[PDB]
Amino acid sequence: RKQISVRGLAGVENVTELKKNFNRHLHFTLVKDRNVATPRDYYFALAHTVRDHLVGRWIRTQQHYYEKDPKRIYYLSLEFYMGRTLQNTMVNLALENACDEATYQLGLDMEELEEIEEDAGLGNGGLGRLAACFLDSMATLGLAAYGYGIRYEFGIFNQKICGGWQMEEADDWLRYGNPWEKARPEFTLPVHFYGRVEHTSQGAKWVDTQVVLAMPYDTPVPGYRNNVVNTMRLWSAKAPNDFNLKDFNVGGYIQAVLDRNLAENISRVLYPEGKELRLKQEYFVVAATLQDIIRRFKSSKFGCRDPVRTNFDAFPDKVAIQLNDTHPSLAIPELMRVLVDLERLDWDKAWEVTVKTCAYTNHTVIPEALERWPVHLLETLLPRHLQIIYEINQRFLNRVAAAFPGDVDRLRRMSLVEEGAVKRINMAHLCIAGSHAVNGVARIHSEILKKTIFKDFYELEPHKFQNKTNGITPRRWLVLCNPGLAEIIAERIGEEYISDLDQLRKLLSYVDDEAFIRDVAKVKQENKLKFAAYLEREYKVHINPNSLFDVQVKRIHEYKRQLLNCLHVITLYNRIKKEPNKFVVPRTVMIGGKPAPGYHMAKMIIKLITAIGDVVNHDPVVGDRLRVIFLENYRVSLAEKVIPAADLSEQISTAGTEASGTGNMKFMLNGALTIGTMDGANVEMAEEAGEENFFIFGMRVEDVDRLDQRGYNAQEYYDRIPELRQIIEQLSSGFFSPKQPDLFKDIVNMLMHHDRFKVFADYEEYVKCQERVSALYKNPREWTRMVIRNIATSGKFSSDRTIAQYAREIWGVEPSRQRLPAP
Amino acid sequence: RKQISVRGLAGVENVTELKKNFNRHLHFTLVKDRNVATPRDYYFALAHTVRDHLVGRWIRTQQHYYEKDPKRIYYLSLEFYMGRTLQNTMVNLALENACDEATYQLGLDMEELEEIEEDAGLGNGGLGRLAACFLDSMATLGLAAYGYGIRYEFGIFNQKICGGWQMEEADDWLRYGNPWEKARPEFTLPVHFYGRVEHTSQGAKWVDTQVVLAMPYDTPVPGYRNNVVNTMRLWSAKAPNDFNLKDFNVGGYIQAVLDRNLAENISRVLYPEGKELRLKQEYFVVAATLQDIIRRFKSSKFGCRDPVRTNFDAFPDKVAIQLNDTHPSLAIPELMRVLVDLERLDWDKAWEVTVKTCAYTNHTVIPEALERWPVHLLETLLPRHLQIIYEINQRFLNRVAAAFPGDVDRLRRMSLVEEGAVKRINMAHLCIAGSHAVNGVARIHSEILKKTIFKDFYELEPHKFQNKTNGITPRRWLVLCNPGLAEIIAERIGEEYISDLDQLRKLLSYVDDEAFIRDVAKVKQENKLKFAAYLEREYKVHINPNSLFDVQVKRIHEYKRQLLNCLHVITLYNRIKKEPNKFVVPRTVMIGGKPAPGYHMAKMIIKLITAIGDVVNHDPVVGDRLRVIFLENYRVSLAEKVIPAADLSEQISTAGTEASGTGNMKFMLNGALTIGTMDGANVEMAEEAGEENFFIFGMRVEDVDRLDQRGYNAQEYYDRIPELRQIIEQLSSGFFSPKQPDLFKDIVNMLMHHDRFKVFADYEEYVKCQERVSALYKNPREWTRMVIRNIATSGKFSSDRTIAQYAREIWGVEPSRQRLPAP
């Protein structure tokens, strides 16, 4: 029975074995054969073959954490934007070449099968992709970390562009199954909703509740070549279904058709606002995760080590829970509920344990976007939790009274309870009172937290407030997506940079080496030729692959100012038509992202870029000095193709609206130069590379506020600037929508009348800054020496630095860049 | 491609590879190890090890039917009572020996791991076990046979006896998955409901329908050691998701919630009567199955060579559809719809093809079991099908008028349309009109069909009508459940009897061999000791393993007469109470079966049997000369435990109510004498063993009709028989329910006043027959020699005999017992 063992079921380094395992998985796991098999079956047979090398190290890692009993860190995010695991797994396991030879000799192209895989429908923007970069960095630095979230069946949609408009189609990324997850039926937990509180002896009993079940699926997340594989655990909502005729209550009408349904769509799709489904989702994931966290605290040595009623005096030493935005804020009233109501701890002990355990990360700005829940909603589905919140509040405000005697307006600004037309719980306030550290995500974001949104809280507890600038994993975003560049770098300085990215600093010694200079340059050329063709392999147009690829890829949002870029695009166009014989550096400007169903302007903006493209891409005069391409259904795998092909990185939000950005750092790493405002982590990128090496422009956060206090009047920019006067009329008159002239009615009036992000205000500096870009592009050697100057200075933005800072400053664990023997 | 073959993926009868593959499945398939594995995890790891060797043979069996395109036979049933696959797959594959030595070197006890498997919650009584026995016989006799049915997610309940009452608990046999089934998402088919018919140019169009998806699950079914592995394809109902935007039906209001709950619960649980949901299960399995039959008829071979527009002319020679009861009878109008509406053949061609394809088996008699559907129900959900049942009826009724000119009573009698308070479609008339062969299930059963229920039809087409007496598979019902008896039969006569059960006649030469005689009794005593201990390993009382094990295991139903057996248990109890010192052959009576929720007389009978056990197993006087035990949750694996332990088999239905029985045959093969009436298959069995070797009592069908014809008054029996009179008044006075004296009121008035099954009329002859059973049990060599006479004469009751007669006489294929080889 000691021979029921892992030890030798998979001889690594081996083509012969990998072809045997490929074939056993095709015929036995899949129950298919070459005659019946489809490329999807081929892809699944390979996913299962790489997969066996993954769960071997997974078993052995969790065995290790069990013997070792370290502090475990729990990262709660309602988004994990994972997108495609095959290639990431093979390079973190060093399987790439071997899988490649093996599929070749088998008659299959590994690349074409890679393209069969779906991007995991588990997230949407930068909150999700950040949790995915962080799980790769926790595994590589050996932390005992777990990702917890929901298993959405439809993710969030795929974007189809019909006639210039975004169409949102359904994403059932799980149609055929997903080879990476492992269902865990055994671990199913119930989550309770509605009910009422019966205040008995000791106290409260939350009675008469509806139950929904939480079933976990696990996915392994491999560290970079150290053999530690960590777990991402995602919950699925399952109805209890004894009802057909059960309890005995049965008869009436089936108003429990509604219980299965409403239980079932807690998992079906992702979200952006304040509705009862969103609160049910938020509580579903908090409740299940905390039950599992306590289950695992209790089994691994602490059920044994009970002393006094399995005590939690050590819980903060063995558990850290990271609360990402206020979406999992209910973890603070929920942990206080399990500890007081179920473990019978004193309120005062449980509160101590809670705040040493939980820490909060705020990821976005401007002081109203943070969750507030009506007290009557909370009263109805979570009655015990309004009770615990009210007590936390009663008690925090007495602290504030202790600190700041007698000034009463701060007690009411600080309150978790907001008054007005409808009383509400401010969840961001909940998050601060109950967390031991709060952080922002880029140095200027954290500063505005201390100075605006959270300044009262900052004055009560200055120490709580930290900064942990976002990072990007250099495995997926360099090694995986830009293999050519990762090679001419390893040739010069070695391969250790892949998990110590500050070693890219060594590259500055080659700024003047003609050989590095032409390599850096050939890789971009090679990457651009590849992209120029993919862009006609799936979809089409005519791309000059010798143009400056100018690209803005991020979600479509007015704060992000795809509109500032459109104004500059049409200026270039008006310029070329006015003087068709003038030399102009040619550009392919590519814009991509997803609106949001129901974000009307964002939908309108996508139709402007389309419209603009139809005019300038079929203009015989313009020729191919300008092409404007809207890249359809941007997502992680498309980010993997276009970001290595880019020359200019558009990072242009209004100073102060973009808390950090993370797309900005993938482009710096992949050899693109950046044009952007002094917002987010752009500030800190310009400081590492040198301001000389960055195309900064526009209004600084200082200047936005000044504009706010004099009052922003867009007519005065219209009036003093004629090319801007010209674009606006072209938009008004139907120049770009000739069939339906005032289609851009809306954009024009928002710009002119109630533009919150001050586009015209930054326009002249923008197009002058762009003019300087074109001048550098015209000089290849210099363009490429500033590119080296950027790639060499990007190490600070590795998610490995970000996570070693969370580990040592908030979680209190030491990173480890050390091998586990395995498999 | 060439190198993507089943290549050499396991060595079979090799312990060394089975331990290897065990370990791969525990670790890489299940993602557990020895620290963490539970008993269930080792069972699932053994299940996947054994399954690999099943699918290798399965793929090769289906390739082989493709290259040989044989006549394929589809066995349609709404029940498949499979009960537990691990041990049947290892002895059918000759792998048990090897697996037993592999789990044992690993430190596991394979007997405990087999016990962890759930019975497949796929069936309920005799219709289901017949279909599972037949799938094992079709495979052993090398037929290209497919079982088609519905995958129920929770079967039809698990029974719990609480306070002596049946309580039904839900069965999710699927909680942890099922390793035997392969989901096939790719092959989803849509089933249509509702709609209306557009009689256009070529004709009808069925338009505006609701769509439910029918997703198949394949389970392999292995023949005894010949390497053919056929398929059980079970359909799962899926709701079409577009509970979001499509048709913008919703997008303001939800009630599409009911289409999802109702679609999906076509699959949730099993049924017994007439409502819209039953008819939706029935049309669902018929529609999806028939698309696959045509698909596979075109695709496998006939979509490239096909002589005349892909010809259905050859379809009756390449497909046989067996219709089990009226539950699949919509296959006759569905075949016609598809051929006439979708394939454009003429109604005459398509009808010629339909009656040559379909055959009908009737399984139970009183017109109740022969479904009738209101034409209003049918006009609403299957409008085109109703148009076709009417056209079939016309044409049929013209045929009967041609044959019987002027006999109008006949026309109105044979018609498929029943008038009355609601016009109805008599579905039995549809299966007879549309089938080329109609059969009953035991010779007296098929006689009464030609004689009473279907005589008009028999008069119109005598040749259609046949008999096919049921059988039992000797693999499950002897080798598997009684390894001891199978072994001492193989020491004398070898092992060819496993697939040629008539060879057991060879054991009549050993009727007088003293060694054979004591081996047959040793085996029986070991089965009893073993079962006496299971009975108190799980559950408990004190069972004297020397007493006569008297057992009745079958559904609780008034025609099966568990009440007659109760009348005798109390006679025996009353006897001992009058003479506590008389010598009595001591008995353990065991009764088991499930009621039917909603069959109230049947839950009263379960309560009587329990109440009678409370009284007698606690009577000090009685000691252990009588014990009454109810076996809780009788299902296929309990029938495998109790049937080898039995001495006496109770088969006591009123003559003329049990069509055949099949449990009667399992008891005969395992060395138990039978006490029974001349009903169903008891008649042919008594005939095979010699009447002298059977304890036959009571009324014969000719007698039941007389008694009927003079009227049954139960009081004249009450009046002339004193032990009876005493039983009834003990029921009445509350002797068996002292806390609630008239608890068994219902029973007493049914018995006294409206017993449809003439219990008092066979009671005297019954208690006397029982005394003879007791006289013989006291003589242990004579009892064993009559057993050898019954075990040696059980060969006609092999389901291999039954299936070779369906093959030759109804399906036009020949059995083969040629071992298709290999891998």
Ligand SMILES: *Cc1c(COP(=O)(O)O)cnc(C)c1O
């Ligand atoms: C990097 C990334 C993001 C974040 O980009 P920002 O410009 O920081 O908003 C969003 N989506 C995808 C697909 C990404 O890979």
Ligand SMILES: *Cc1c(COP(=O)(O)O)cnc(C)c1O
């Ligand atoms: C054989 C069998 C039956 C049928 O028994 P009869 O007495 O013929 O009705 C029913 N249930 C199970 C579990 C069986 O094994």
Ligand SMILES: OC[C@@H]1[C@@H](O)[C@H](O)[C@@H](O)c2nnnn21
């Ligand atoms: O921290 C990750 C990212 C930031 O980089 C973005 O700037 C910010 O808009 C945001 N909102 N949610 N998550 N994020």
Ligand SMILES: OC[C@@H]1[C@@H](O)[C@H](O)[C@@H](O)c2nnnn21
């Ligand atoms: O034919 C199979 C079995 C018969 O053996 C039973 O006697 C009969 O009651 C029945 N009803 N449905 N299925 N069955």
